[PDB]
């Protein structure tokens, strides 16, 4: 009750004010733990009340920070898990087959235990996601290869550190200005023994002619295979497409969102202009419009491969993955 | 003269029966020497008769072997030299300026010495073409580059040997089947300490993703910037264009032919089917049509740069060079 309410309020305020969990996996774990706490603590008779309350909590969580899709992704995953559990315990996708062939009020005592067990299994699968993704590094990196990365991605870092145990290759890291987080990635990879280069975004095209493949992370994967990545990733994808350089996205399955690129102006995250133009400029700040978008939209035609904890896939298959994770009625939430 | 006639017939028969000067520079030199001998020995009262006889032997030379454009190029160069000498001695290109603003057969008794001097100057300029092309190797090759070649080109071999004195790089040579002359090129490049790889044509598109730039020779440069090259160069150029890999053609100026790619079915050189399918196959040779084209047509849009003894040019400028070498009335010959 009070503990649950204060935990929810703290989570919402942390999302609204930023900071909190740097790791996306940590954010997913905290979201799942909070959802489990709501399921255990909150009182509900039938599954319909659970749907309504989880939907309200997820709506509040995503309204706190719409650019943080992992929270909504986990909320929809929990809703799908609850729906599947109810269908298994009570009963026995839209398609041409279903179209040709063709009630949550009922109550069950053991449904809650099954829901918690499924959520715990999901958490266990989430725990080993990074190792599962990194275990595929040797199948995609050959000897004396050149890899291009932008910003700081922990999944890509684990990928490269696992590949470096048996192969020698070069990694080029482009800083993601203004938050030049690529410097930390470069120094980490150098500490791991990999030979690394640090450069600004302005050189992304210039050196792309000498890059064998591009390995990047993302914040979100849309239903059509599009990316909500850090800013400057669209230019990197365009430069890779110019040279037909394969672009690999190493992203866990919990970053898949059933949304579509129809949404406008809430996609990119806009922050204080101080990052781009300092406050000490003076009077010219009065008449100059300064905008600092954090995220970028990447169309699916610029992506070659998705590597996740379940293996490799093409963007054209992303829809099927989206069909296996979320019910079509939970996209609106 | 009888000796001149026997030399002309020897040249014509050598062209018809194949072989002869292995290097294109040697055959250009031989053509220029033969033209000089014809000019000296034959009796001509005025410039028009000299033009007519030059055109007659040029027609015979070109009809001996149409696929060898160097002979016709030298004949047309001599004709343009005669035109410019007669115009400078006697008097003072179709353009809008000439159109808005708007004859031979007048004997002068001083044109022959000028013609011979210009021919000798052309010969001296022809002697040092390969060194002039090779001197620009360092401006186009950087450290630890990957270069790709097809067949055996002496100009490209000189290019790479000159570049290898100061930089270290890798060279991949694709054998030009059936006449696998790329083996000779790879062995020669390995003799100079360059790390080299031998592979077949079928692997070209397989390795273009790891190639930085493609440096090739050619047999002929057409008026629009197209190429007559060894068979397999068109697919190599298409593969380079797929990856936006810069394709450099190292070809001297005497390989520029003022004809257009309108001509068909005589562009390629069809040789005996023994090179592709051996005679020992037996009865199946009765009902199998096997063709062995020696040359390939490369459209101008697949060529990035032309490196010649006068420097680097784009294909879009080739027309101007044509207008600087040949008179438009000598294109038909």
Curated annotation (Swiss-Prot), chains A, B:
Changing residue 195 to G: In VWM2; with and without ovarian failure. GO terms for biological process: central nervous system development; cytoplasmic translational initiation; myelination; oligodendrocyte development; ovarian follicle development; regulation of translational initiation; response to glucose; response to heat. Activated by the chemical integrated stress response (ISR) inhibitor ISRIB which stimulates guanine nucleotide exchange factor activity for both phosphorylated and unphosphorylated eIF2. It is linked to Leukoencephalopathy with vanishing white matter 2: An autosomal recessive brain disease characterized by neurological features including progressive cerebellar ataxia, spasticity, and cognitive deficits. Brain imaging shows abnormal white matter that vanishes over time and is replaced by cerebrospinal fluid. Disease severity ranges from fatal infantile forms to adult forms without neurological deterioration. The disease is progressive with, in most individuals, additional episodes of rapid deterioration following febrile infections or minor head trauma. Belongs to the eIF-2B alpha/beta/delta subunits family. The lineage of its organism: Eukaryota, Metazoa, Chordata, Craniata, Vertebrata. Acts as a component of the translation initiation factor 2B (eIF2B) complex, which catalyzes the exchange of GDP for GTP on eukaryotic initiation factor 2 (eIF2) gamma subunit. Its guanine nucleotide exchange factor activity is repressed when bound to eIF2 complex phosphorylated on the alpha subunit, thereby limiting the amount of methionyl-initiator methionine tRNA available to the ribosome and consequently global translation is repressed. Pfam families: IF-2B. It is found in: Cytoplasm, Cytosol. The keyword Cytoplasm applies. Keywords: Cytoplasm, Disease variant, Initiation factor, Leukodystrophy, Protein biosynthesis. One of its GO terms (molecular function) is GTP binding. It comes from Homo sapiens. Coiled coil: none annotated. This is Translation initiation factor eIF2B subunit beta. Changing residue 153 to F: In VWM2; with ovarian failure. Component of the translation initiation factor 2B (eIF2B) complex which is a heterodecamer of two sets of five different subunits: alpha, beta, gamma, delta and epsilon. Subunits alpha, beta and delta comprise a regulatory subcomplex and subunits epsilon and gamma comprise a catalytic subcomplex. Within the complex, the hexameric regulatory complex resides at the center, with the two heterodimeric catalytic subcomplexes bound on opposite sides. One of its GO terms (cellular component) is cytoplasm.
């Amino acid at each position: 009750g009070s503990e649950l309410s204060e935990r929810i309020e703290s989570f919402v305020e942390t999302l609204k004010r930023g900071g909190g969990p740097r790791s996306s996996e940590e954010m997913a774990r905290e979201t799942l733990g909070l959802l489990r706490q709501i399921i255990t603590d909150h009182r509900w008779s039938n599954a319909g009340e659970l749907m309504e309350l989880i939907r309200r909590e997820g709506r509040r969580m995503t309204a706190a920070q719409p650019s943080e899709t992992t929270v909504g992704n986990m909320v929809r995953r929990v809703l799908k898990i609850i729906r599947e559990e109810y269908g298994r315990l009570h009963g026995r996708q839209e398609s041409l087959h279903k179209l040709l062939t063709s009630d949550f009020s009922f109550h069950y005592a053991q449904l809650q235990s099954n829901i918690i067990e499924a959520i715990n299994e999901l958490l266990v699968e989430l725990e080993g996601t990074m190792e599962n993704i990194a275990a595929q590094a040797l199948e995609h990196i050959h000897s004396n290869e050149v890899i291009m990365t932008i910003g700081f991605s922990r999944t890509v870092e684990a990928f490269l550190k696992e590949a470096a145990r048996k192969r020698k290759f070069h990694v080029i890291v482009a800083e993601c200005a203004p938050f030049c987080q690529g410097h930390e990635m470069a120094v980490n990879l150098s500490k791991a023994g990999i030979e690394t280069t640090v450069m600004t975004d302005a050189a992304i095209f210039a050196v792309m002619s000498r890059v064998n493949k591009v390995i990047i992370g993302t914040k979100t994967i849309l239903a059509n295979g599009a990316l909500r990545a850090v800013t400057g990733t669209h230019t990197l994808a365009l430069a890779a497409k110019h040279h037909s350089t394969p672009l690999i996205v190493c992203a866990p399955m919990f970053k898949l969102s059933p949304q579509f690129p129809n949404e406008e102006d809430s996609f990119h995250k806009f922050v204080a202009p101080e990052e781009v133009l300092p406050f000490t400029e003076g009077d010219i700040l009065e008449k100059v419009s300064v905008h600092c978008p954090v995220f970028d939209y990447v169309p699916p035609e610029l992506i070659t491969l998705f590597i996740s904890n379940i293996g490799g896939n093409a963007p054209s298959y992303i829809y099927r993955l989206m069909s296996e994770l979320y019910h079509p009625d939970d996209h609106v939430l």
